[model samples]
Target: EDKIKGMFNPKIWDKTFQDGLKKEIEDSQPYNWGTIHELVNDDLLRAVRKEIETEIHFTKKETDIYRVNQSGDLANLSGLDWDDLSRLPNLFKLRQILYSKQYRDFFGYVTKAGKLSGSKTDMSINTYTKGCHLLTHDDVIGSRRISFILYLPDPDRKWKSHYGGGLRLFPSILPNVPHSDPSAKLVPQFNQIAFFKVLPGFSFHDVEEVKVDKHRLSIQGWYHIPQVGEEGYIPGELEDFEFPKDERNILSFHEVKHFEKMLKVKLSEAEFTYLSQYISPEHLSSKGIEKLQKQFVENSSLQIESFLNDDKSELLKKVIKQKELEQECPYHSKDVKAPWKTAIPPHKARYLYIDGKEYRNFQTEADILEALNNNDLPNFQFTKDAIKIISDASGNSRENNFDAELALIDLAVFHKSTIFKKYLALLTSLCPVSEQILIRRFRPGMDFTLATKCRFNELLKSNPDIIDAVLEGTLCLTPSAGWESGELGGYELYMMDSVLINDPPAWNTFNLVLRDESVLEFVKYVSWSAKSSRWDVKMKWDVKSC
Candidate 1:
């Protein structure tokens, strides 16, 4: 008891300290969060770090959002035999101090987390080295009441902000809608502790990528509501908290009909001529279009190689190659600007894209309503102008230096045309009314999208005429070699929610997928070791069978 008591700062036992911490937590912006420096006994923590490094076996766990060396739940310490326990005495002792009754009461009071279970010790250790990261997510899994990280970065030097691995907290625009950008970041140092009360859908946070070739180790653990037979246990207290569903409905019958008209609408010779400048003659040929349509109907997907003509393809290849060699890519969000926005909820995705429409991030219910209200036709000309602006501001001296982006965005403009969408209608035999087009760049080492099913816009779910999926297209413009082997992993994968369409990065190839609600898709994380980014044009449309 004496040794445990000495582990924490003496002020932790004072009434004044407790009251001040409680007030600060209550007043914290974005959400209730707090941090404490030098929260543990220095010597004991140093020993714990040493034991973890020498005795613990860590496995490299890789997923869509992160890759880190993780240890099994430290809670297993309590069940270890005497032999194993003897080897990790400091870890066992540290766990006890963290979850001790005295500490639980102090933590509960400060965060207003009514009751915490001392018997339920949920904790783990992870080490993030260069290239490791955890994307944005609300720690609302299970019965967790509070989330915390105890930093154990190199003790000999101060952990610098430039070194990357920082805990970033995102501000909520509403109860469930988090802003695309983080407003607060905590760069932790040795023996520091950062924590927050886990608010369902509201407490969104992520660990920034570790930029240097050094280890940033930490103990991550959670406090949960009391269990049965415990002091403050309540029946059903640990039941998962369900977030309120956003009240947005699907498309109306009339809206679907309007799109049906546009889908059947034919393009003029001038429009075809304009499209010919970018699209390959083969794809535009009547015979080629009919062939693709037949294949799409049978399998609900098609991968067409050489989707562009040689002239347009060669131009794109030259510009993209030059940019990859000459231009400096933005690796951080602050460096990104107009026409290119970073996809948010990093747990969902992280990539640079041109939405080719208005800049929109759903920060509130009103944001959704506003978009639904302004059902404007896609304007390729506006997208063209935006590309000009982005191009003019990029690369050596800023003049004529951004031809690559200009060419890419111009291709995006072609895809956004009512005419191109008409072509899509012909291929799928479905007329699309609502559309989204993006020219995306998934940077090597820093970008990826996790496996997820297509989310049917809830507003369209009730419309009987609406199809059960969105017709999606991906035009791979990745000008690279060796991707076919899957080692460099910039492949687009589609499965039947049970299972593999492994389409590797290739030049001028188009993948059209009739993605039903049950279909799962993802782009594998691009390795930083790759020579270039995974560049592509992505298209999606809400369609109806005529």
Candidate 2:
């Protein structure tokens, strides 16, 4: 008991310090979180860091939410044997003092988290080097009561905010709906510990990208609710919900019928001429389409090259390359301009997209309902005319550089057209009944979609014509190089038993696949080293047998 108490700072035992910490935790913005400076004995903490660097091995782990050098699982330190204890004596002692009853009582008092199980130790060590980031998530995993991170950066220097690797906390727009941007951040330093109660909807947070060339190492851990041997143990206690729940908010029945009716309409030479302006003439020919259909039927997918005409491709490439060279991409969600909105609950996705509706940063159910009520379709002519007015007023200056958006929106409109649906139906032999088009841009280092299976519309399943599959299309407009090897990421992949298709973002390529619940798909996170964002128009259609 004496040894354990000696490891932690004496300030943690003071009445004044305890009261201050509780109040700070209670008053913290973006959720209840508090930080303490010099919480552990300085020499002991330094020894712990030394032991980690000397003993552990770190592996580069990359996923949708994070990119970090992760140490081997240190969960359940109680399971450690004599050899493990001998190998990491300082770290083991640190863990013991941290979960000691005296410390748990103080932690529980301040954060208002009840008894934490001492036997169930959950901890990991990670080093966030340059370009490493963990995106927004609430950390509401099973039996967790409190989440904490003990910073172990270089002891001599102050960790600067500009160097990044800050713990960023997000405010909740509503329960389970986190705002797209963080409102508060903590720039951690040596021997500093930041902690918060693991909240279901309220505790959205992320580790900001480490921008510098140095390493930012930390110990991440959680205090569990209770276990069989602990005082606060409950037999069946479980967390209410998890992040990134498979979600595709289907449109209303009336909206579905509108798209259905549009799909049924006949097309003529006028529509064909409009489509031909954007699409390759070869793809429009009956013979070419027949050949494409044969390929799709054989492999259940198609990756068609040069999907767009030379004129359109050249113009798009010029505008995109210029924008990549000259423009500054907005990293914050609020700074994103009109007609483009950041995806919500970014643990599932983080991308800029135009959904053919009025711009909104949804803050409540009312905002979402407002968007749903005024749900509109893409209008190419409006965007074209709008660009013309701007360009005519002045040359395509940086302020009004909307040439890329204009071209992308035009492409989205073309895919949403009735004639295009007819062509798709002829090729796939599945008649599309309803549709949704999104012009998406996955910015380098900042955008991606986590792997997930298809989500079906519950309302549409009632109709006899609606099938269990969705026809998905991605028209890749990325003009950048360095993506040929997929080392810079931004590749769309389909997987189940094995990787069915892995296609990197390529210029003027069109990929179409019939997705069922069995197959999972996602666009890998874009790398910062890439030349530009991966620009694409994504289309989804509910279809029936022809």
Candidate 3:
């Protein structure tokens, strides 16, 4: 018999190098992690990259969490027929070496992770080009023991920090609580392998959006816990990993009361006159309200046509259209201006929104407390004055003005008014108990909200007449074309039994729905080809019957 050779590069078997890696892992910042250069044989990896480039086909896929060019899962490479192997033989060989028992033993010893299941492989190849990104999350999915990525960017050139696509890590303030800002980052290189134990609550990471026109290719995979018949496979071990899942917390009593107090507005002449100026004459009439109440009572949903009067509608449309067509949008996180905040944990949502609060991303528990304690109501006058300065200074230059922002904030202030809640009660016969209003902008290529359930104040659930639902309303201000087919997405989808409602963006239309806990809704991702952002003033209220 001939002498045996190793699957991995022989350097991985060296005792001195192995010990050094273990020490590096122990001393890692933020969390335990280690990276190895030239993880595989040079020629072997180069051929693998060539095979991928020649044979693999990638499709651009996008969702709330990520936008990237992705190849099909390569986990089942072992099951492929011999004929298919001819196209990706090197790729298959690379996977075999990566999952080999010899390499797994070394990986486990260094990471201090327990035995991994060879049978349960998980992997996918992806290309992060311009605008592609993955937001923050701890790699805590079921049975995952370790997470790893092997880079395959150009070997000749360096992947710079400003180019983006760096692997960023975050520190945890406590268990299950990761800070919003990342403390450590790795600008990866070709032929490098980065890995860490998939420690729940401690391993928060993300891939920054790629800012350049370059293909940052990589293979991402996770090693799982021992499978059946494997040693250390304790029965119910996997169950325990997923036993305690995440549950949404309810609003506090103080917060609920505060929100309730904001909604308490008495009938007055001043309110009626202000409401008349913005809203359509038909919707302001007693006859129109009676019809709306009947419709809402019949189906718990109503869509009003021509929600605003001609005067207000004409002025708003002109400003919004000009901003969309002429003004530049800021895509980077730091570039997002004041009074507007970009939603965090891009996995859940990513959109620009004005919520009537001072600009601050949720960085700490104390920061969140400050936001909740110092909750502010919409004051468009302040916003207008600030815009007025910019508007007056840059009267000739369209690029430096905030006319659309001023116009939209006026609409938001109108919705947040106590009189508006009175009008809402007239239409739905539900007394508004608490309220929050947001002016949201979903960019054509960069924004969306994943399907999520309506949240209610649990403390208010005890009252018999307090309806167990959130009254949601959207006043669409999108000024664009080619969205009629919904091919460009940006449509709002509500699902319960099936499709409860699918409302696309339109001008001067208002949609109201009484969403129970069972109903889940989201705005679909906008396409790159979309003409403009989907603009809307979103209003939510906790309501109860008289």
Candidate 4:
């Protein structure tokens, strides 16, 4: 009976079209779903596209995180002028109309809930499909009253089903479990709006991948009440809590690991009690970070003396001296936010620089060296500029001065009187890319914090083992990605990680075997003499026990 009514008199939507829509909602069953296709004004959409072309600041492919380029948080990334309403006026108007009170009231009626009043609702402005895909999840965020998407594709053409991108609705086996497949799909045209009531764990859906590469612009938003309210509100029960449904037993493992790792650090009984909500084994144990720090220092400096004697080290020292002569470079870049083009620190330095400031006071060089030695890493500006330059040169990129980075790696370890070594978050690039590093200025009274790179996977491959080593009583070197901004004549960022990026399990451990025999091999490894290209360096290895 419900199906019969739904097929004959499908849901109708109008602020004034409510009489029919109400009947449509009342008769609709299974799940309250509706799609008002071809709802957008084509002329307005075309104007918006021109605005995007003019205003949006689209960057090349950068890992998986890309946006139109916004400054701070207020502006759009596409560099569109919000101030100039005329440019993206259509998009602006669309957001306004969809969020208008009338629309919210109409949606609220069907959902049997009051219209949510604030940002707590699912209101969001985002792109979808292809590289812009959103992983699947239900739209039941806390306090959300309704969920919706307003499509604004090419206004002139009909958005056919074969075009690949579509709204896919998944059916649930139980309240919290959705079946693997979708039950219905709605292919939207230039102006269409699709919506659903917030069902918490039940209303599962995703934007299907857009087959070809084209912009699928849409306004995704929701209606919500203010955080404090009287509209049939649940006091403390307003929090979202739906993760307990999976049968993988994954949480239990995480809980146990959390407790085990926690015991290793100092914590007050109150803190421990607070943590016990999900943690097991009570406390994190001995395979604590300190022991691993020592191992990293030792391993990193394994064959320093021979590396020091190599001729390549000379070129690196020269490079370091050259950089030093010029003055310390500013933290390279940290444009993680808008206008992401900060100058590099004048000289080589390490230990995360943040918000663009240098911090240089550790108790001692030994303190800094021990950090490098233990694979614990120092402040980005912790070590002397000369020291970092020398260290950097030893790596393959600095091959003209071979073993400079290697020698520094060794000296860094020897200072601590231990061989275990690893470098975490070290941004090295076989290819050259502009870097925007972050560092702390160490506000006189407060202790200093390390500098961190703004972008992840932008230059060097990620150092997962760097984290894993903290577990194995060993160390890891976390380096940054390389640059290839065309100015330096290298490939694009996408191709830079091609070889090293795909190495599965990705070099979890590398033994530095600097023997007389190994030293000769190391010298060859860092030499750039043979390649017509500016540089061609490879990593050398030796087998040793952890």
Which stretches of candidate 2 lie above 4 Å from their native place?
73-83, 228-275, 281-291, 363-366, 372-396, 463-465, 485-487
Note the residue pairs that clash in candidate 1: 249-459, 250-458, 250-459, 250-460, 251-459, 251-460, 280-309
Q: Give me candidate 2's TM-score against the actual structure.
A: 0.86
Per-candidate TM equals 0.76, 0.86, 0.72, 0.39
Model 1 ranges off by over 4 Å: 14-17, 73-86, 232-299, 320-347, 358-375, 385-406, 416-435, 443-448, 455-467, 480-491, 502-506, 524-533, 541-546
Clash count of each predicted structure: 7, 0, 0, 89
RMSD of each: 6.1, 4.8, 6.9, 22.1
**TM-score top scorer:** 2
lDDT of 1 by residue, 1-546 (tens): 766677888888889999999999999978889998899888889999998888877766666566788776344452223235578889888899999988888889998988899988888888998767787789999889999999998888999987888899988765665665678999989999999999997899988777788899999999998887698577765001111111222334564554477555255688668768777887777788788878998988899999888888999899888878876787766677555667754546778877656655454558656766774444556866766675556643533476776788778767766666666777778877666777888888667887877768777788887788887889999998878876566789898754448887899999999888888898987866577899998878777788
Top lDDT: which candidate number?
2
lDDT against true structure, model 3: 0.76
Give the Å shift of residue 438 in candidate 4. Answer: 40
When 3 and 4 are scored with lDDT, the better candidate is: 3
lDDT of each: 0.77, 0.79, 0.76, 0.36
Candidate 4 segments whose C-alpha is farther than 4 A from its true place: 1-20, 23-30, 40-42, 58-87, 116-124, 129-131, 226-546
TM-score computed on alpha carbons, candidate 4: 0.39
